Design a protein around this ligand. Structure first.
Ligand SMILES: *[C@@H]1O[C@H](CO)[C@@H](O[C@@H]2O[C@H](CO)[C@@H](O[C@@H]3O[C@H](CO[C@H]4O[C@H](CO[C@H]5O[C@H](CO)[C@@H](O)[C@H](O)[C@@H]5O)[C@@H](O)[C@H](O[C@H]5O[C@H](CO)[C@@H](O)[C@H](O)[C@@H]5O[C@H]5O[C@H](CO)[C@@H](O)[C@H](O)[C@@H]5O)[C@@H]4O)[C@@H](O)[C@H](O[C@H]4O[C@H](CO)[C@@H](O)[C@H](O)[C@@H]4O[C@H]4O[C@H](CO)[C@@H](O)[C@H](O)[C@@H]4O[C@H]4O[C@H](CO)[C@@H](O)[C@H](O)[C@@H]4O)[C@@H]3O)[C@H](O)[C@H]2NC(C)=O)[C@H](O)[C@H]1NC(C)=O
Ligand SMILES: *[C@@H]1O[C@H](CO)[C@@H](O[C@@H]2O[C@H](CO)[C@@H](O[C@@H]3O[C@H](CO[C@H]4O[C@H](CO[C@H]5O[C@H](CO)[C@@H](O)[C@H](O)[C@@H]5O[C@H]5O[C@H](CO)[C@@H](O)[C@H](O)[C@@H]5O)[C@@H](O)[C@H](O[C@H]5O[C@H](CO)[C@@H](O)[C@H](O)[C@@H]5O)[C@@H]4O)[C@@H](O)[C@H](O[C@H]4O[C@H](CO)[C@@H](O)[C@H](O)[C@@H]4O[C@H]4O[C@H](CO)[C@@H](O)[C@H](O)[C@@H]4O)[C@@H]3O)[C@H](O)[C@H]2NC(C)=O)[C@H](O)[C@H]1NC(C)=O
Ligand SMILES: *[C@@H]1O[C@H](CO)[C@@H](O[C@@H]2O[C@H](CO)[C@@H](O[C@@H]3O[C@H](CO[C@H]4O[C@H](CO)[C@@H](O)[C@H](O[C@H]5O[C@H](CO)[C@@H](O)[C@H](O)[C@@H]5O)[C@@H]4O)[C@@H](O)[C@H](O[C@H]4O[C@H](CO)[C@@H](O)[C@H](O)[C@@H]4O[C@H]4O[C@H](CO)[C@@H](O)[C@H](O)[C@@H]4O[C@H]4O[C@H](CO)[C@@H](O)[C@H](O)[C@@H]4O)[C@@H]3O)[C@H](O)[C@H]2NC(C)=O)[C@H](O)[C@H]1NC(C)=O
Ligand SMILES: *[C@@H]1O[C@H](CO)[C@@H](O[C@@H]2O[C@H](CO)[C@@H](O[C@@H]3O[C@H](CO[C@H]4O[C@H](CO)[C@@H](O)[C@H](O[C@H]5O[C@H](CO)[C@@H](O)[C@H](O)[C@@H]5O)[C@@H]4O)[C@@H](O)[C@H](O[C@H]4O[C@H](CO)[C@@H](O)[C@H](O)[C@@H]4O[C@H]4O[C@H](CO)[C@@H](O)[C@H](O)[C@@H]4O[C@H]4O[C@H](CO)[C@@H](O)[C@H](O)[C@@H]4O)[C@@H]3O)[C@H](O)[C@H]2NC(C)=O)[C@H](O)[C@H]1NC(C)=O
Ligand SMILES: *[C@@H]1O[C@H](CO)[C@@H](O[C@@H]2O[C@H](CO)[C@@H](O[C@@H]3O[C@H](CO[C@H]4O[C@H](CO)[C@@H](O)[C@H](O[C@H]5O[C@H](CO)[C@@H](O)[C@H](O)[C@@H]5O)[C@@H]4O)[C@@H](O)[C@H](O[C@H]4O[C@H](CO)[C@@H](O)[C@H](O)[C@@H]4O[C@H]4O[C@H](CO)[C@@H](O)[C@H](O)[C@@H]4O)[C@@H]3O)[C@H](O)[C@H]2NC(C)=O)[C@H](O)[C@H]1NC(C)=O
Ligand SMILES: *[C@@H]1O[C@H](CO)[C@@H](O[C@@H]2O[C@H](CO)[C@@H](O[C@@H]3O[C@H](CO[C@H]4O[C@H](CO[C@H]5O[C@H](CO)[C@@H](O)[C@H](O)[C@@H]5O)[C@@H](O)[C@H](O[C@H]5O[C@H](CO)[C@@H](O)[C@H](O)[C@@H]5O)[C@@H]4O)[C@@H](O)[C@H](O[C@H]4O[C@H](CO)[C@@H](O)[C@H](O)[C@@H]4O)[C@@H]3O)[C@H](O)[C@H]2NC(C)=O)[C@H](O)[C@H]1NC(C)=O
Ligand SMILES: *[C@@H]1O[C@H](CO)[C@@H](O[C@@H]2O[C@H](CO)[C@@H](O[C@@H]3O[C@H](CO)[C@@H](O)[C@H](O[C@H]4O[C@H](CO)[C@@H](O)[C@H](O)[C@@H]4O)[C@@H]3O)[C@H](O)[C@H]2NC(C)=O)[C@H](O)[C@H]1NC(C)=O
Ligand code: NAG
Lengths: 228, 210, 48, 87, 87
């Protein structure tokens, strides 16, 4: 077993210090070589840099000075530090184990080869916004079940900034039938989203129907019950 | 700029990425499944690890003055995703940003109409001197809908916020539509309506106030 | 234009045979400079 | 007066460039005109002349130069030295 | 690069001009200077090079050129092929 999980603040003001961390599982930091990749909206991914013990820690030249990668031996998590953050730095960041190799085309002693790494296992992602606009937690007014056989139910989140937000029903117990929709930005800058489940005619109850939301940037956890 | 590749199911697609070759290279290839993370599919010019089967053929690094190609053989619905390549030329320096994407789209997918479900303004919201109804457009191929609203008979222009058709992981698109009203004008009318328009069909959903 | 990689001109000889044949010249050389003599090989001193 | 650079390459700083891509005003079939054209030269076949990086063919101060016909061969073929009669 | 026209003539349009009056920058006894001077050439001895009507001597892309000494003669005079002795 081996798996990765990135995390971050989610929002940064112009000219500040971006900071990210990535949970590890199965294998540890000393064992492997670590790398980050950020991917702006609707664009190709940009390789950030790589890191390993013994000083093998070279970065992207385009990022230049403002980037500083690091590590944490005891706690066993990969680290990142970026200064002078701007609108260009708005992207979904990734952490990943990089795996090196050798490609040879001539004589090795003549140094006619190069070192090439690829990244085999990624994480989920790290949505990082950067705007001078201040954060706002969500407002929640759950959709009542109305428009035998089958039925339908919903949970609306009205206004927030910035993305993203997770929606687990009954803290993750209720999972089947969730067709949660992607957000929509208003002219104010706020997003809005809505979750829905399908539930058959067997729905009198009283049943524990809740859509537990989690807005990490504004530590907001508003979980509302819903019934006919 | 955005490039596309389209084939029938069970065929063999071919996808190219990056600058023309100079010296011998190693080229890495990835697959961004919309929503999910980029997945390493090929590491050497034609080497595949576990989790990814054959044949995801590729251009060998041994050629010069040549383009880098990725040949999908026996395509299926699951193979539909964005792709990227990483180049390492003996002559050119380290490429610090994956080459531009080339999105694959197989043919003759399930022609499917949406699953609209129009909810009304929930009692809590109305109490907050604010009112919105939401119709949620789900499972429709392809993702090219246009949704209008109607205050009973008459159409509605203002306040209408709308998403962009987004492909969820399962062979389905999803989109939503909103509008901002006041509770007193929502109760005043007989029935507000959400009229989606598919490729041909227009489905109506319409909620009235208690 | 140079088609392909940019590599370096070179020549290969067997280290085994060079060892063998450089041993032959030494066996012969000692006939002129004494049986109890060191005969090592060095590169060019300098010039064109 | 050549105007030379290095050849398209990504080598370690230690490894010096031995293939200089040189562009130069060359003569035409007609006396009237000229032609800027490029060629590749080894580092040993050129010398830095003197913020442009301009060079010259090394022979230019020592001697003249004559291009061997490609329709000729350098292969060493066996020769026999035969004597005259009564020799 | 010659700059040529037709020779002074009043011929019917059908009859093409076979004598092109060509003016050109020619060299001088001194390296310092030049001289625009004209000569007459047959249509076969020139090619259109390319609203000026400019031409070139046809040899300029195929071969070099050497002017026969007028102090020589092309007249075919009778030759006899004599054998050596014992032939
Ligand atoms: C003077 O003396 C000097 C010094 O002695 C000498 O210099 C030598 O010059 C030669 C050429 O002039 C040069 O050869 C190159 O060698 C490259 C490296 O090969 C070695 O490594 C690989 C990989 O090692 C992995 O595995 C190791 C464990 O074994 C591990 O420790 C490593 O870390 C690494 O992970 C290895 O495969 C090689 O072993 C092969 O050769 C053995 C010879 O005894 C043989 O016993 C093995 O079985 C093995 O054979 C396999 O590979 C050959 C390849 O030809 C196949 O034919 C067989 O069927 C087997 O599959 C070595 O240990 C090598 O990568 C170079 O070849 C690639 O690169 C050139 C670049 O232009 C291409 O033109 C080639 O076509 C070839 O490209 C293929 O491979 C690469 C990398 O895999 C791919 O990216 C390409 O897309 C392409 O792949 C396609 O084709 C292949 C089949 O061709 C196929 O497998 C693919 O699926 C795909 O279809 C090149 O051969 C050598 O480095 C250099 N130095 C030394 C020390 O030898 C001078 O020549 C001398 N000069 C004179 C005048 O005498
Ligand atoms: C030693 O030094 C030498 C110099 O002294 C050096 O030689 C020179 O090298 C350069 C490369 O570094 C060569 O330049 C290349 O020329 C190619 C041919 O250009 C063709 O297209 C021109 C018009 O089309 C333009 O506009 C289009 C938009 O409408 C663009 O899409 C085109 O790409 C192109 O834009 C490029 O060209 C413009 C000039 O026209 C330029 O302003 C612009 O900024 C951009 O660079 C035609 O004019 C041209 O026609 C002439 O040339 C042909 C022969 O080539 C003749 O037959 C004609 O009669 C006429 O004389 C061509 O039809 C370019 O394709 C190439 O650009 C590519 O690379 C850049 C890199 O960023 C890309 O941005 C660009 O889009 C191109 O990419 C495309 O092609 C590549 C390659 O196929 C492909 O991989 C890629 O995916 C994409 O498809 C570049 O400009 C130059 O010709 C060399 N000169 C000589 C004399 O050799 C030599 O290499 C050195 N050697 C060593 C060993 O170091
Ligand atoms: C093959 O043959 C080719 C053709 O012969 C050849 O290409 C030629 O190369 C030369 C040298 O590289 C080029 O000369 C330079 O041209 C620069 C471009 O400027 C042009 O375009 C401008 C518009 O953008 C025009 O304004 C300008 O003309 C104007 O300026 C003149 C200045 O006197 C003036 O008299 C004119 O009437 C007109 O008003 C021109 O047409 C030009 O900018 C450049 O001048 C300086 O800047 C260069 C960089 O851009 C420097 O490299 C150069 O050194 C110059 O700096 C000078 O001044 C500094 C401040 O005083 C000094 O410190 C410097 O030392 C330097 O002084 C030297 O140069 C002076 C020239 O102005 C000279 O007067 C001094 O005595 C001293 O020697 C320069 O003029 C030319 O344009 C190219 N021609 C073509 C057709 O391409 C090619 O190199 C050959 N080889 C190969 C491989 O192809
Ligand atoms: C033997 O050797 C002889 C000497 O080398 C040679 O004679 C020379 O032949 C050339 C070409 O036929 C002559 O050049 C032309 O000269 C025209 C006369 O203008 C002169 O006198 C004017 C006063 O009446 C001056 O104003 C003028 O100088 C001014 O203009 C310059 C323009 O850049 C400027 O930079 C100067 O500082 C100055 O201010 C000059 O002294 C001249 O008019 C002509 O220009 C155009 O018009 C010609 C017809 O009159 C056209 O044939 C020619 O093509 C030009 O049009 C250009 O512009 C158009 C609009 O942009 C373009 O569409 C055209 O394609 C063309 O562009 C080309 O030409 C540009 C030149 O300006 C060039 O910059 C472009 O890049 C492009 O290539 C042109 O300058 C020269 O004067 C002759 N010299 C002598 C001493 O006689 C002779 O041909 C050789 N052969 C034989 C058999 O004798
Ligand atoms: C300077 O250059 C010279 C040459 O320019 C170098 O000298 C050369 O050195 C190589 C080895 O380093 C010599 O090659 C040897 O050839 C042996 C004979 O092979 C032939 O016979 C067998 C049957 O016995 C045939 O099957 C072969 O044909 C097959 O192989 C060729 C490719 O090689 C294919 O193209 C064909 O289609 C065939 O498939 C030949 O005709 C050979 O025995 C030897 O080693 C082989 O065997 C060992 C096991 O003992 C294997 O480990 C090894 O991999 C070889 O395997 C080949 O042969 C088997 C069959 O025996 C096949 O089944 C395999 O597929 C594989 O092809 C070796 O290959 C060469 O002869 C020699 N030339 C000269 C002129 O001296 C110098 O070293 C060099 N010096 C310096 C300093 O640089
Ligand atoms: C385009 O050109 C650029 C040029 O800038 C180039 O980028 C450079 O890439 C190189 C290679 O990555 C960077 O150079 C160093 O990389 C070190 C990584 O360690 C490697 O080297 C170890 C020792 O190598 C020995 O053997 C090789 C031959 O194999 C020989 O050439 C060496 O000289 C040396 O003798 C090697 O041990 C190591 O591990 C391998 O081997 C062991 C077995 O021995 C095995 O167990 C391992 O699994 C593995 O296979 C590995 O191969 C890195 O440590 C080093 O950084 C140190 O030095 C700097 C000071 O210079 C310190 O500041 C730093 O903290 C470290 O102490 C250095 O990075 C070089 O840095 C790159 N350049 C830049 C600017 O980043 C591109 O690759 C080229 N691209 C293309 C496509 O051509
Ligand atoms: C999975 O990931 C989570 C989250 O990343 C991780 O939680 C860790 O919890 C510890 C608390 O036990 C955090 O520790 C703090 O980290 C911050 C940021 O670096 C430090 O600033 C804190 O104080 C340090 O600096 C102070 C400066 O004055 C010192 O005084 C002080 O002594 C410290 O040196 C403190 O260390 C930690 O940040 C998170 N995250 C990480 C990546 O460690 C969790 O442990 C991971 N594993 C599991 C199983 O959940
Ligand atoms: C050197 O010693 C060897 C010993 O076997 C002998 O055969 C040889 O003749 C000696 N040569 C000279 C020059 O003394």
């Amino acid at each position: 077993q081996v798996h990765l999980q990135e995390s971050g603040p989610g929002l940064v003001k112009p000219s500040e210090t971006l900071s990210l961390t990535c949970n590890v599982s199965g294998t540890l930091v000393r064992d492997n070589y670590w790398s980050w990749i950020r991917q702006p909206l609707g664009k190709q991914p940009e390789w950030i840099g790589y890191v390993h013990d013994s000083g093998d820690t070279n970065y992207n030249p385009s990022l230049k000075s403002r980037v500083h990668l690091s590590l944490d031996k005891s706690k066993n998590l990969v680290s990142l530090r970026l200064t002078g953050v701007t609108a260009a730095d708005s992207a979904i960041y990734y952490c990943a184990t990089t795996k090196h190799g050798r490609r040879i085309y001539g004589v090795v002693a003549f140094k006619e080869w190069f070192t090439y790494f690829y990244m085999d296992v990624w994480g989920k992602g790290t949505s990082v916004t950067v705007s001078s606009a201040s954060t706002k937690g969500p407002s929640v007014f759950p959709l009542a079940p109305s428009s035998g056989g089958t039925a339908a139910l919903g949970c609306l989140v009205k206004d927030y900034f910035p993305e993203p937000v997770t929606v687990s029903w009954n803290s993750g117990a209720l999972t089947s039938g969730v067709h949660t929709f992607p957000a929509v930005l208003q002219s104010s800058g706020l997003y809005s989203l809505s979750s829905v489940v399908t539930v058959p005619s067997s729905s009198l109850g009283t049943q524990t129907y809740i859509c537990n939301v989690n807005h990490k940037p504004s530590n907001t956890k508003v979980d509302k019950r819903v019934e006919p | 700029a955005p490039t596309f590749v389209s084939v029938a199911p069970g065929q063999t697609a071919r996808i190219t990425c990056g600058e023309e070759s100079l010296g011998s290279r190693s080229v890495i290839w990835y697959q961004q499944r919309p929503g999910q993370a980029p997945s390493l599919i090929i590491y050497n010019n034609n080497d595949r690890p576990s989790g990814i089967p054959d044949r995801f053929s590729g251009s060998p690094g041994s050629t010069f003055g040549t383009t880098a190609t990725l040949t999908i053989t026996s395509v299926e619905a699951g193979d539909e995703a964005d792709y990227y390549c990483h180049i390492w030329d003996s002559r050119r320096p380290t490429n610090w940003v994956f080459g531009e994407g080339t999105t694959l789209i197989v043919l003759s997918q399930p022609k499917a109409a949406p699953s609209v479900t129009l909810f009304p303004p929930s009692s809590e919201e109305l109490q907050a001197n604010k009112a919105t109804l939401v119709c949620l457009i789900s499972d429709f191929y392809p993702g090219a809908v246009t949704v209008a609203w109607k205050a009973d008979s008459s159409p509605v222009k203002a306040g209408v916020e709308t998403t962009t058709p987004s492909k969820q992981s399962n062979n389905k698109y999803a989109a939503s539509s909103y509008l901002s009203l006041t509770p007193e004008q929502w109760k005043s009318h007989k029935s507000y309506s959400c009229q989606v328009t598919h490729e041909g069909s227009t489905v109506e959903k319409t909620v009235a106030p208690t | 234009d140079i088609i392909g990689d940019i590599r370096q001109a070179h020549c290969n000889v067997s280290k085994a045979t060079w060892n063998e044949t450089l041993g032959k010249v030494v066996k012969q050389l000692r006939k002129h400079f004494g049986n109890n003599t060191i005969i090592r090989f060095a590169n060019s001193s300098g010039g064109d | 007066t050549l105007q030379c650079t290095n050849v398209t390459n990504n080598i370690t700083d230690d490894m010096r460039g031995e293939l200089k891509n040189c562009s130069f005003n060359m003569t035409t079939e007609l006396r009237d005109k000229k032609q800027k054209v490029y060629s590749l030269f080894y580092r040993l076949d050129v010398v830095q002349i003197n913020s442009n990086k301009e060079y010259r063919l090394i022979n230019c101060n020592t001697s003249a130069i004559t291009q061997a016909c490609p329709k000729v061969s350098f292969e060493p073929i066996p020769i026999h030295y035969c004597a005259p009669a009564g020799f």
